[PDB]
Design a protein around this nucleic acid. Structure first.
Ligand SMILES: [Mg+2]
Ligand SMILES: [Mg+2]
Ligand SMILES: [Mg+2]
Ligand SMILES: [Mg+2]
Ligand SMILES: [Mg+2]
Ligand SMILES: [Mg+2]
Ligand SMILES: [Mg+2]
Ligand SMILES: [Mg+2]
Ligand SMILES: [Mg+2]
Ligand SMILES: [Mg+2]
Ligand SMILES: [Mg+2]
Ligand SMILES: [Mg+2]
Lengths: 142, 283, 58, 48, 46, 141, 6, 161
RNA sequence: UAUACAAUUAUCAUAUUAAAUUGUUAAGUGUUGAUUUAACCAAUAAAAAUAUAAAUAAUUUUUAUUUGUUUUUAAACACCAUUAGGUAUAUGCAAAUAUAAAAUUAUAGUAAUUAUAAAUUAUAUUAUAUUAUAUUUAUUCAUAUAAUUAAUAGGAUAAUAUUUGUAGUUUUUGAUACCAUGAUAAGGAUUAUAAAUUGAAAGUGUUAAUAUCAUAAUCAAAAUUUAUUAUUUAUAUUAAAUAUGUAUGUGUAGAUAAAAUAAGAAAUUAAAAAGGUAUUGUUGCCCACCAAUUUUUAUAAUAAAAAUAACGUGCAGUAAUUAAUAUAUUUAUAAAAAUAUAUUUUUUUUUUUU
């Protein structure tokens, strides 16, 4: 890769813009996971049946010391709002916290409550060249 | 300069000395140049043209047991029509060379016949013997053609030659029959050809072809015979020899006789010469 | 012809070399040895071509 | 050529070389081997 | 092709190179040959 | 294949900015969601333009004859209950059976986005005058 | 041409 | 195979025959195929036909165009003949004339220096064997009539100065 | 330190038997104005044609005579300077390649040589037949993450093993996040039709002798800046792994892509002559001024000459970016440049009365 954002920058090649078979791209990057729909609200990026049980990740499975963030496929439950306990999720740069609890979240997965690609951009994680290219696309002011 | 270094390979039970100096080079400005060729037992004998010097009982056994090579060549070329062989351009080339082998002597004799005004009476045993001896000396390589020719024209004939020539010739050009009859006679009496007729035929034929040429019986003295610089084999005088956007890249793809067949290291997509991609239906 | 004209069962498409070779080194049997004696257009049987044989049989 | 050596069974460039049997030769067994018959080992297990 | 001019039409191998010569053009109408032969012969006598 | 340049460090106080921005993006999304649900339901509940294309048959026919007779006397109540939404309208026509095989085959219907216009729509421009602040997938007025 | 030596 | 025959094939690099050392590159220009001075087969025809076209449009004469296309039909074979004969000339010229680029050029004045020398020598012995390569001073456009009595009005021999 | 040119043909400065010298011809006004030049500027434009014979050959002209410098512009061209002007071609002075010589340089003590020519160096409009580029369709192109690579060990139907439960820390250092040679890609431009392929060697991350900073590797659910990518465009539109909310705008700039192959397209081609101060050869060599120093002397703005490897100008030369070479005269940061003559150690272009 051109820039190494992780270790894998060293190991992987891009291969230009290369086509992969349908719904298998090596890296699952869900840009769409928060993509508003009123009519599809309960069917989009959620369980295919409402009679399914909540995933593994809503439960404490073993003897734990504690966790840092809960997984993002965990589904937001009335207790998430009510209990007033830390609810963290791993997003980038670091972690997203649900601080301001609402019932409107309930019954959806935190995938869906966390905007993956923010309209906010750090100018300090960008090279002067990259900043130029972000000004061309009409994102950054200059 | 980050100059690349190559460590010498020493001879090994599978990697003998000559294999090493020929297939491996320690100087890497000489890599990726091109292929070199060498010859082995028979192809070496062809290229080097080593005349066999005569020897003991085996060599005369094989001078007497030889038979007609003019014919054997012909047979071997023909034999390519056999079910288990192909017809070769090489086999043909060998036949051709044996048939057309008679230009060195036949050419010379053509010159003595047609290139000389007034070579005396060529039936007389004197001049006849001159010609005979010189011929046998052009064959068996004992003399240069040029030297034997200048020998022939400077040979001793008869006192006051020109002034006896004024009693026969006007412009000093004699008749050419005696010359050709003698020149055929000599090749017959000497053992020059295996089959008797060939001598006369060739000596005749080569003259008939030159008859049509502009200033036919004159020759530039430098090109007339062996000299440092020569004419191309087509122009020698009495000689016997007188898609499309991709086919750089298709260079292997027809029906190609090979020498070395290509190999998968050197050829990425080629399938081989025998292959038919677009076959028709045949009963 | 690139290679001798012989029933192709005698040839093998070489590995690693673009060329065919003979699966019996250099021996060659002519077409005549595939068919019965004096077989019309060397043929298992003279009456019909392959397809003719099939549908006659059917 | 490499730090990983060729494995002589799967490589045709070993198998079909001049030091082994080419695929166009006649493929029969070379010599028979009687090992177990000539000198036989008595059974002793590692486990009792 | 690529940033370079197209080859002239004659620089490609023949478009119909794989079609036999008896197909281009087809000589059909053989049925009539004999007919017209007789006809012409007849006319001569007339 | 060049060695990948190292990525610059993240930013100072950008963790706070990202937290806040996502936080109130979500808070905003609650009202965007509330509002688009309101819109979706308001659309389902309100009337639409007639789904059938009158340029073809059996629909071109004068409103006093044929299919329109069949509609005024037998189907009217139902057609109004479903508010001329194009899906239930087409289904009702299949179930009235007095047209029968024609509904899909001979009859033509307006395209999706036109059929979705509010009843009363006069100019075509209306398709583009609906609210873009709301996430209904064109199911909003 | 003048600068060619570099 | 091309060593010792220094001329290479034909239509090929170093195939050109030489005449007193300078190569023969004009062959087609000789037989008048493809030259500016090139021989023209039919003129009277083409002129006749052109006249016909220019005169009037009421009558159209294809008779002229028939005489002309006849003429052309012959011209083709004529030209192939001339070309063939010319290639035979190239062959003959190579055999019996050309030196194969082995003799010194005769075609530029310095090659003839010795000749000019012979002339300079003469003008020197006329001058009492003195001024070699010397020539009279060029005077003026009208030196004779612009000069007064007592000065040389015409250019003298160099020794005479 | 002494120790044997040539004398048949040798290019820079010591000439020598030679007939010349003298000729008064030509050309010039009608009228309203873009000539010459690659480009500038001054500003009437037309013109100067004739002489052979004869002169005897050699022996004391060498302080004698002689080798393109020239009055008159009130006459031009031309050249030089730039609108002002200069100059505009053998009456003074002036020996000088046409070879009499002994290795290069150098005023005749300097450095150790120099000079030289044919090997090699891709484009200068030479010819029918073996048969066609001027058609069609395209162009909004984005996607990577949460560190420990080092060894063997067999079980039922077996003539007997607790070997059920096999237990000896600790001296080495590279493929790593890091310098650490090799090897396969892509890229149509003239071996054609018959029984036949429209994909190439000149090398595109992962591979074998240079080590001497660091555990960075996917087992899910994740963060767009990257030249190198054919997406669904208006009757009906989210059900199983979770699967994309955005750009309706007169098929509309510039610029671009693809194809003669079971498809269907039909008429505007190339060959043959050429130079090297370099020597795997133009990314080659070289030239002067401009500093230090070394050394000889016949000390001219600032002595001359020879060694020489800095710095700074340039680009003089190798037919070399207005061809070079020699003489002459002028000019000047420096190679050098302008003009007047000769000349090829410069490459050639060729009417036997039209
Ligand atoms: Mg040449
Ligand atoms: Mg002298
Ligand atoms: Mg490589
Ligand atoms: Mg690991
Ligand atoms: Mg000194
Ligand atoms: Mg000095
Ligand atoms: Mg220069
Ligand atoms: Mg110059
Ligand atoms: Mg120059
Ligand atoms: Mg000069
Ligand atoms: Mg200067
Ligand atoms: Mg000068």
């Amino acid at each position: 890769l051109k820039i190494a954002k992780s270790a894998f920058g060293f190991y992987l090649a891009r291969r230009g813009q290369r086509k992969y078979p349908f719904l298998r791209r090596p890296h699952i990057k869900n840009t769409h996971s928060m993509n508003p729909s009123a009519p599809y609200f309960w069917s989009f990026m959620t369980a295919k049946s409402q009679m399914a049980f909540l995933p593994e990740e809503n439960y404490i499975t073993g003897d734990w010391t504690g966790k840092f963030f809960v997984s993002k496929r965990q589904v937001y439950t009335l207790q998430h709002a009510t209990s007033g306990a830390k609810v963290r999720v791993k997003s980038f740069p670091s972690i997203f916290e649900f601080n301001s609890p609402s019932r409107w979240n309930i019954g959806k997965e935190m995938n869906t409550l966390t905007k993956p690609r923010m309209d906010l951009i750090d100018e300090q994680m960008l090279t002067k060249k990259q900043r130029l290219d972000y000004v061309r696309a009409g994102l950054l002011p200059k | 300069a980050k100059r690349r270094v190559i460590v010498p390979i020493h001879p090994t039970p599978n990697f003998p000395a000559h294999f090493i100096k020929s297939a491996f080079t320690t100087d890497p400005l000489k890599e990726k140049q091109k292929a070199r060729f060498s010859s082995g037992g028979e192809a070496m004998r062809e290229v080097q043209d080593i005349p066999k010097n005569l020897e003991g009982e085996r060599s005369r056994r094989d001078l007497a047991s030889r038979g007609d090579t003019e014919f054997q060549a012909l047979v071997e070329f023909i034999e390519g029509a056999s079910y288990d062989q192909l017809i070769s351009g090489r086999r043909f080339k060998k036949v051709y060379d044996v048939l057309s082998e008679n230009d060195d002597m036949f050419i010379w004799l053509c010159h003595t016949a047609m290139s000389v005004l007034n070579p005396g009476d060529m039936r007389s045993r004197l001049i006849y013997n001159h010609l005979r001896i010189l011929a046998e000396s052009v064959a068996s390589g004992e003399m240069t053609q040029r030297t034997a020719f200048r020998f022939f024209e400077s040979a001793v004939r008869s006192p006051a030659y020109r002034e006896i020539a004024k009693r026969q010739l006007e412009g000093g050009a004699a008749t050419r029959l005696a010359g050709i009859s003698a020149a055929a006679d000599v090749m017959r009496r000497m053992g020059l050809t295996r089959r008797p007729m060939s001598s006369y035929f060739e000596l005749y034929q080569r003259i008939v072809e030159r008859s049509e040429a502009m200033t036919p019986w004159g020759f530039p003295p430098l090109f007339q015979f062996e000299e440092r610089l020569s004419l191309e084999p087509r122009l020698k005088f009495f000689s016997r020899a007188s898609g499309h956007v991709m086919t750089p890249h298709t260079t292997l793809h027809g029906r190609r006789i090979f020498w070395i067949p290509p190999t998968w290291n050197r050829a990425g997509r080629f399938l081989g010469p025998h292959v038919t991609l677009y076959p028709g239906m045949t009963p | 012809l690139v290679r001798p004209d012989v029933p192709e069962d005698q040839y093998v498409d070489s590995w690693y070399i673009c060329t065919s070779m003979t699966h019996h080194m250099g021996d060659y049997r002519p077409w005549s040895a595939s068919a019965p004696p004096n077989a019309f257009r060397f043929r298992p049987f003279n009456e019909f071509d392959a397809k003719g044989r099939e549908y006659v049989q059917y | 050529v490499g730090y990983t050596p060729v494995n002589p069974d799967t490589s045709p460039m070993v198998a079909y070389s001049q030091y082994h049997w080419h695929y166009n030769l006649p493929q029969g067994m070379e010599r028979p081997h009687s090992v177990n018959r000539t000198f036989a080992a008595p059974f002793q297990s590692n486990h009792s | 092709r690529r940033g370079k001019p197209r080859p002239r039409a004659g620089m490609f191998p023949d478009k119909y190179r794989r079609v036999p010569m008896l197909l281009k053009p087809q000589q059909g109408g053989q049925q009539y040959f004999n007919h017209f032969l007789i006809r012409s012969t007849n006319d001569r006598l007339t | 294949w060049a060695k990948p340049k190292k990525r610059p460090k993240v930013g100072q106080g950008f963790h706070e900015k990202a937290q806040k921005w996502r936080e109130e993006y979500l808070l905003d999304r609650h009202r965007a969601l509330a509002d688009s649900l309101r819109a979706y339901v308001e659309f389902s509940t309100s009337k639409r333009v007639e789904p059938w294309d009158a340029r073809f048959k059996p629909f071109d026919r004068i409103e006093k004859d044929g299919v329109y007779v069949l509609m005024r006397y037998m189907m009217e109540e139902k057609l109004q209950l479903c508010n001329y939404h194009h899906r239930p309208v087409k289904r009702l026509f299949c179930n009235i059976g007095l047209m029968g095989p024609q509904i899909t085959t001979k009859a033509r219907w307006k395209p999706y986005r036109f059929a979705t216009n509010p009843a009363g729509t006069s100019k075509a421009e209306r398709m583009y005058q609906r609210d873009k602040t709301v996430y209904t997938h064109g199911h909003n007025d | 041409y003048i600068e060619r030596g570099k | 195979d091309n060593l010792g025959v220094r001329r290479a094939g034909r239509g090929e690099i170093d195939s050109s025959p030489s005449h007193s050392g300078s190569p023969v590159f004009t062959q087609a220009k000789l037989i008048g195929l493809s030259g500016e001075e090139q021989l023209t087969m039919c003129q009277s025809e083409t002129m006749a036909l052109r006249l016909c076209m220019a005169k009037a449009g009421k009558e159209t004469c294809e008779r002229e165009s028939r005489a002309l296309d006849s003429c052309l039909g012959r011209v083709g074979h004529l030209r192939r003949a001339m070309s063939e004969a010319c290639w035979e000339f190239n062959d003959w010229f190579i055999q019996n004339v050309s030196d194969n680029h082995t003799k010194p050029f005769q075609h530029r004045p310095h090659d003839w220096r010795h000749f000019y020398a012979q002339e300079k020598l003469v003008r020197e012995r006329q001058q009492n064997g003195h001024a070699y390569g010397r020539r009279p001073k060029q005077f003026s456009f009208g030196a004779r009539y612009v000069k007064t009595d007592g000065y040389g009005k015409r250019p003298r021999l160099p020794y005479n100065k």
